[PDB]
Enzyme design. Structure first.
Site, PDB file in Angstrom:
ATOM      1  N   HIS A  68       0.814  -1.498  -0.042  1.00  0.00           N
ATOM      2  CA  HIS A  68      -0.082  -0.075  -0.060  1.00  0.00           C
ATOM      3  C   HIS A  68       1.053   1.199   0.058  1.00  0.00           C
ATOM      4  O   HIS A  68       0.775   2.081   0.818  1.00  0.00           O
ATOM      5  CB  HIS A  68      -0.942  -0.205   1.136  1.00  0.00           C
ATOM      6  N   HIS A  72       1.928   1.477  -5.749  1.00  0.00           N
ATOM      7  CA  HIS A  72       0.517   1.104  -5.935  1.00  0.00           C
ATOM      8  C   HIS A  72      -0.482   2.450  -6.276  1.00  0.00           C
ATOM      9  O   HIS A  72      -1.158   2.053  -7.149  1.00  0.00           O
ATOM     10  CB  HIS A  72       0.020   0.500  -4.615  1.00  0.00           C
ATOM     11  N   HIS A 106      -5.624   7.805  -3.160  1.00  0.00           N
ATOM     12  CA  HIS A 106      -6.799   6.689  -2.472  1.00  0.00           C
ATOM     13  C   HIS A 106      -6.090   6.084  -1.311  1.00  0.00           C
ATOM     14  O   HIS A 106      -7.231   5.440  -0.723  1.00  0.00           O
ATOM     15  CB  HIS A 106      -7.442   5.900  -3.663  1.00  0.00           C
ATOM     16  N   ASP A 107      -4.798   5.676  -1.302  1.00  0.00           N
ATOM     17  CA  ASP A 107      -4.319   4.909  -0.212  1.00  0.00           C
ATOM     18  C   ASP A 107      -3.342   6.046   0.848  1.00  0.00           C
ATOM     19  O   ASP A 107      -2.637   5.259   1.390  1.00  0.00           O
ATOM     20  CB  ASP A 107      -3.733   3.748  -0.537  1.00  0.00           C
ATOM     21  N   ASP A 217      -8.085  -0.591  -8.301  1.00  0.00           N
ATOM     22  CA  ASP A 217      -7.478  -0.756  -7.120  1.00  0.00           C
ATOM     23  C   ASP A 217      -6.981  -2.409  -7.146  1.00  0.00           C
ATOM     24  O   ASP A 217      -5.810  -2.782  -6.372  1.00  0.00           O
ATOM     25  CB  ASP A 217      -8.452  -0.657  -5.991  1.00  0.00           C
ATOM     26  N   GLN A 269      -6.055 -17.923  -3.129  1.00  0.00           N
ATOM     27  CA  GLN A 269      -6.047 -16.629  -4.631  1.00  0.00           C
ATOM     28  C   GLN A 269      -7.165 -17.201  -5.447  1.00  0.00           C
ATOM     29  O   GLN A 269      -7.960 -16.516  -5.914  1.00  0.00           O
ATOM     30  CB  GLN A 269      -4.516 -17.059  -5.262  1.00  0.00           C
TER      31      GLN A 269
HETATM   32  O1  LIG Z   1     -11.456 -14.024   0.197  1.00  0.00           O
HETATM   33  C1  LIG Z   1     -10.254 -14.255   0.370  1.00  0.00           C
HETATM   34  N1  LIG Z   1     -10.074 -15.695   0.586  1.00  0.00           N
HETATM   35  C2  LIG Z   1      -8.588 -16.055   0.656  1.00  0.00           C
HETATM   36  C3  LIG Z   1      -7.972 -14.588   0.178  1.00  0.00           C
HETATM   37  C4  LIG Z   1      -6.727 -14.323  -0.029  1.00  0.00           C
HETATM   38  C5  LIG Z   1      -6.284 -13.089  -0.436  1.00  0.00           C
HETATM   39  C6  LIG Z   1      -7.338 -12.093  -0.753  1.00  0.00           C
HETATM   40  N2  LIG Z   1      -7.046 -10.939  -1.356  1.00  0.00           N
HETATM   41  C7  LIG Z   1      -5.986 -10.695  -2.256  1.00  0.00           C
HETATM   42  O2  LIG Z   1      -5.305 -11.438  -2.953  1.00  0.00           O
HETATM   43  C8  LIG Z   1      -6.283  -9.120  -2.622  1.00  0.00           C
HETATM   44  N3  LIG Z   1      -6.557  -8.287  -2.229  1.00  0.00           N
HETATM   45  C9  LIG Z   1      -6.625  -6.977  -2.418  1.00  0.00           C
HETATM   46  C10 LIG Z   1      -7.483  -5.953  -1.543  1.00  0.00           C
HETATM   47  C11 LIG Z   1      -6.789  -5.442  -0.596  1.00  0.00           C
HETATM   48  C12 LIG Z   1      -8.126  -6.270  -0.287  1.00  0.00           C
HETATM   49  C13 LIG Z   1      -6.131  -6.455  -3.576  1.00  0.00           C
HETATM   50  C14 LIG Z   1      -5.188  -7.390  -4.284  1.00  0.00           C
HETATM   51  C15 LIG Z   1      -5.158  -8.771  -3.915  1.00  0.00           C
HETATM   52  N4  LIG Z   1      -4.757  -9.862  -4.562  1.00  0.00           N
HETATM   53  C16 LIG Z   1      -3.210  -9.632  -5.517  1.00  0.00           C
HETATM   54  C17 LIG Z   1      -2.859 -10.732  -6.458  1.00  0.00           C
HETATM   55  N5  LIG Z   1      -2.165 -10.772  -7.112  1.00  0.00           N
HETATM   56  C18 LIG Z   1      -1.359  -9.525  -6.973  1.00  0.00           C
HETATM   57  N6  LIG Z   1      -1.493  -8.521  -6.226  1.00  0.00           N
HETATM   58  C19 LIG Z   1      -2.350  -8.633  -5.445  1.00  0.00           C
HETATM   59  C20 LIG Z   1      -8.601 -12.498  -0.560  1.00  0.00           C
HETATM   60  C21 LIG Z   1      -9.132 -13.781  -0.227  1.00  0.00           C
HETATM   61 MG   LIG Z   2      -7.258   1.293   0.221  1.00  0.00          MG
HETATM   62 ZN   LIG Z   3      -5.524   0.394  -2.998  1.00  0.00          ZN
END
Ligand SMILES: O=C1NCc2ccc(NC(=O)c3nc(C4CC4)ccc3Nc3cncnc3)cc21
Ligand SMILES: [Mg+2]
Ligand SMILES: [Zn+2]
Length: 317
Positions: A68, A72, A106-107, A217, A269
């Protein structure tokens, strides 16, 4: 007009692709953002000196956290740039001016902890803002910076225009609270399928802009696999640190925040792409068809996580 921003040949071409990566040179990111503002808004949208002063003050109020962070902010802004350039007839002058700025801001001042941890910690911000705690803090930080001497990038707008663009920015930043996304995408899905969605309805624009902010985002799941895989290391570094802090409070963390549950990341994932990402880019593609490459790249990464779960690929940590 006399001085225009230019990028090297590779960046000039690839910045137009949704899956562009802004690279490891921090000193180039301000130039990349100005270039995107000049092309998506216009060279006359802002005074270069105020915009430059604003950019550097925003950078200074992002922190040295794994995900963050300032990189980003600029990445989320670049995804908004690609959406605006490929949908250029649909947005107003104020929306172009407000939305790249909203993405950059935004962050602001993120410390790498979720609203839920601030609530459990009993952080003062949780008393100030009961819902969307961090997002109301990000907006408040945006207003602070805009009110610094020489930082009013909107100085040529009337009071009523200034008030509109600050209201665009406020709604856009609050929409990045993923807790609000589930309700907003459901509403948008029903509005689309019953043929009631109306881009002349301001309350409907707010929802569409919210969905665009979610898509921007989350845009790290829409990069080429090598970028998506490496960025997943950054997000989990924050999640696992929060999980440690939850254990320090004597509260069991949710599985994705427990560093002892590292072997379950590929399944988590898969869980996140199916419940959040794929529905997000699907609804966006229905409303804004030229955003198709985001959904395609998201599907490709979902297929890579399945290959990982089948042991045909290995995620190094
Ligand atoms: O529901 C769930 N059950 C298990 C689990 C694991 C992880 C997540 N969240 C994310 O992986 C994730 N979240 C955010 C937002 C801040 C919230 C942004 C990006 C993200 N992934 C990502 C992937 N590849 C490269 N960069 C970022 C949700 C769950
Ligand atoms: Mg945020
Ligand atoms: Zn963000």
């Amino acid at each position: 007009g006399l001085m225009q921003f230019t990028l090297p040949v590779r960046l000039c071409k690839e910045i137009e692709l949704f899956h562009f990566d802004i690279g490891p040179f921090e000193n180039m990111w301000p130039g990349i953002f100005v270039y995107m503002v000049h092309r998506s808004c216009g060279t006359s949208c802002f005074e270069l000196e105020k915009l430059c002063r604003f950019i550097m003050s925003v950078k200074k109020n992002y922190r040295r956290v794994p995900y963050h962070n300032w990189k980003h902010a600029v990445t989320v802004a670049h995804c908004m740039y690609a959406i605006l350039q490929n949908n250029h007839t649909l947005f107003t002058d104020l929306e172009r001016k407000g939305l790249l700025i909203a993405c950059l801001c935004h962050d602001l001042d993120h410390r790498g902890f979720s609203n839920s941890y601030l609530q459990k910690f009993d952080h003062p911000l949780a008393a100030l803002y009961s819902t969307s705690t961090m997002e109301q803090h990000h907006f408040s930080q945006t207003v602070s910076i805009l009110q610094l001497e020489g930082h009013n990038i909107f100085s040529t707008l009337s009071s009523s225009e200034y008030e509109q663009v600050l209201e665009i920015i406020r709604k856009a930043i609050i929409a990045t609270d993923l807790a609000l996304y589930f309700g907003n995408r459901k509403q948008l899905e029903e509005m689309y399928q019953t043929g009631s969605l109306n881009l002349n309805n301001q309350s409907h624009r707010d929802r569409v802009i919210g969905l665009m902010m979610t898509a921007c985002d989350l845009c790290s799941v829409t990069k080429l696999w090598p970028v998506t895989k490496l960025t997943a290391n950054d997000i989990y570094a924050e999640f696992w640190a929060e999980g440690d802090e939850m254990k320090k409070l004597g509260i069991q963390p949710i599985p994705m925040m427990d560093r002892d549950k590292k072997d379950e990341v590929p399944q988590g994932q898969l869980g996140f792409y199916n419940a959040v990402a794929i529905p997000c880019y699907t609804t966006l593609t229905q409303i804004l068809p030229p955003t198709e490459p985001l959904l395609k790249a998201c599907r490709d990464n979902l297929s890579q996580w399945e290959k990982v779960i089948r042991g045909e690929e290995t995620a190094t940590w």
